[model samples]
Target chain A: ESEEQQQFRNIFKQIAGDDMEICADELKKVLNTVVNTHGFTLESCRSMIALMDTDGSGKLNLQEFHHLWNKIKAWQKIFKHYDTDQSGTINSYEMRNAVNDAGFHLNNQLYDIITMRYADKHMNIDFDSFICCFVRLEGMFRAFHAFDKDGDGIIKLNVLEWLQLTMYAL
Target chain B: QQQFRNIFKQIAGDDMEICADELKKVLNTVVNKTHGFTLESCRSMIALMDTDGSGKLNLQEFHHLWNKIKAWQKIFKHYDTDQSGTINSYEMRNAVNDAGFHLNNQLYDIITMRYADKHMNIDFDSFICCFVRLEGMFRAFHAFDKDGDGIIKLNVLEWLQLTMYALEHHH
Candidate 1:
């Protein structure tokens, strides 16, 4: 095996603790297993790990190792939304549907606005944008509740002032 | 001691209470009026402003806010050479006339200033602080709102607000 591949195998064995030999199939399998077991798509997983493995070496170094772990923690939080069934694994259908549902919840106008600001000319959405966009949407709704200070479902003047003051101060 | 007591009593009189209530009422009105702007953006802006994470802003935080507003005002003035208080639909339309797309007031509001008050014509300090805060709030908002509903509901807002308030009050 190539040195890089051998290194990758060693690291994978250390992290994953599987006896399986490391090969293209093994890499694909691990990615698939993560998708099936953890609800992260292959593409998303690749993107998450892309910045870490910067040396073009397939094997993850120590820095890459910690980076990958941190990213996994982040992904775990994000995956909570998609695991509708509460099953550890996310199937292809669930993945596509969840992504689509997220898009739909964003609504047409707001989604368009978000895309205009964040998406590329080709309209491709990356992992960072995906995370940021969703996070922003979530925060907007949270503000609504905080601003509605009087326990009334409808937002009142106090809420707006708090929002304004908070925005100014923040 | 008598003079101090009298001053305190005067400050806490019914009129003061009414004014405080009125301010609260006004705040509610403003929040409702500007529903288009997301709460996430506001919360994030506040977090960013609290650089020390002390919850309450000191002179340093205030200065930071001022700096941001100045930058935004400079940019806005570049587009609004006439220095009109309001950038009417016509001015907005004409300003973006070169972009091959017709401009409207709503579109202008989104592009130029999402959180700026209509009458305020965002100064330098408010502009910069508001922008950073909005960006940060959006980031947090997205993380919290699992349903992806366009509006941030009560539970999430409460969590964020409580955290922010605690930070401010205690720290």
Candidate 2:
């Protein structure tokens, strides 16, 4: 994480109790009341605990939880930005709009790849897949920007052509 | 909000900061249906936003939890099952309804669209977003009932902020 990235996560962590992890058992107890109906169930919480546990310790420290937190925070933020109609999904145009607004450039093929990659059966990027997909995209964009000597910006022409290939290859 | 205020008064009386026990009352009342809001959850929730680390929640912190409380306390208890972190159309109707709104077909359609998984046609993220707005609107109605009469007058101004959020076009 960059300084700015760290600072951003610091805000979220601080909000979530002095940067403490909701420990595996503690998280289970808390999650019991939270899941099982419209959100999550206690059953699902274990798998999550497993994912974030990172060391089979049956406990999560702040660092492991923070990794998950950033993913969720980024996901929810992006889903809202493009889900303009609140249709629970974003269309191809919305994705294009999102890429541009995010200071990213996706030409037709890359854009097509993105649509095919994320869109559900109806050709819409629904929330779950959007989250799964954008986590990767955010990482990709972050990496791309990280390489830009002064941080990345839009190119007037062909942002995804040689630039993406060159960047990805590197 | 009333539930929060009630418990706050019970715990703090005229005091400033609310002890963990008092906050527990508020959460337990809300989560009674969903595993009775364990003592651990109380400590967990309190610790979540206790900016001062006094092991107690201040007025600001208590209110902070209120917003958090709104979306989580209700949405999850009635919808998600088996920890899959998702809900379906049937579950959703119950969720929005119990969240205390009419959820007219238009809004209902929008919500169903917004939260549905591509495969199952239901998702948690969108549900959480939709649930927050529903809760905000429900609270607004309460705010509008300045006399606490459950009916409205034309004098209140606080609802402007609500209209900004709740009445904003669905999307």
Candidate 3:
């Protein structure tokens, strides 16, 4: 019944509408999109969820949801900085930059073409756009993993160099 | 070594004077035209520059003042959004808006593109570089208005367009 709680409830009502279930479902979708697009692993999401679910509660109240939403937006700014070329796209070079920014060691190129072409110059990528970019990049990585043939994640020897040479020949 | 020193000396002398003159002219013009730049703001700016609490800014104080002015100028350009000198309330709001939060994709792209075009890892020197370039253009436009006409003629626009096109191509 405090003023702060009343204000929070009002904002929650504005956003959540009459359907709490739908709101929760939409939030889950947004979180999943963030995870796949930004290359965050399942472990990372669990840790993030734990931190956001303050008061030892397994569920996020409206306030917690809004707080996490703001944090994600801030993180997206940092991500966009590395998504250089301003193509609304991020290729292997950009992905490498992102990994390096996050202090990860991605020594090998995971995919041949890691492009994230936006629908247009406005560069306003929606949830669907985010999903498309994420899946395309992931698909390329999976394709490369298959191409390695021996099932060892590393592209051993000069196989990549040989592939480039063979492609040039055609 | 001597050739290098000569080149450095010539650039230092000429460039410093040119830059100083350019800064003075632009600052005076901006002060005269901008609505919010009151006498109080001028006094506060001067006071901030007077590092030793002196009434007047010394050479070191002036240099520091110039650097601060240049830094804000770069931010202003980035925030202007529509290439207009004055940042309306909407533009100000958009400048600090969180990406993918409240703004739609088109609005986000427009703001992002403007920011990218104007700013890239801005520092004091880079800020000054942009300030000088913009000031030079303003001066050229002012000069192009030869007939004391407030409106820029078609020929003036053509000349301005050519200059901007050349600069854009160079970038």
Per-candidate Cα RMSD to the true structure, in Å, reads 21.4, 21.0, 21.8
Better of 2 and 3 by DockQ: 2
TM-score against native, each model: 0.26, 0.29, 0.23
Worst 10 residues of 2 chain B by lDDT: B162-171
Question: Which lDDT values do the candidates have, in the order given?
Answer: 0.42, 0.51, 0.40
TM-score of predicted chain B, candidate 3:
0.36
Q: Candidate 1 docking: what grade? A: incorrect
lDDT of 1 by residue, A17-100 (tens): 443323333334554554432233433334333334545564445455455555445655655666566754344334344446
Ranking by TM-score: 2, 1, 3
DockQ of each: 0.02, 0.02, 0.01
DockQ of 1: 0.02
Residue B67 in model 1: shift from native, Å? Answer: 21
- Tens-digit per-residue lDDT, A29-147, candidate 3: 54665355434333333334444555445545766765655655554664687655565544445555653554333333222111212222232343233333333333334335545
Q: What's candidate 3's DockQ score?
A: 0.01
Candidate 1 A-chain TM-score: 0.36
Lowest-scoring 10 consecutive residues by lDDT in candidate 3 chain B?
B162-171
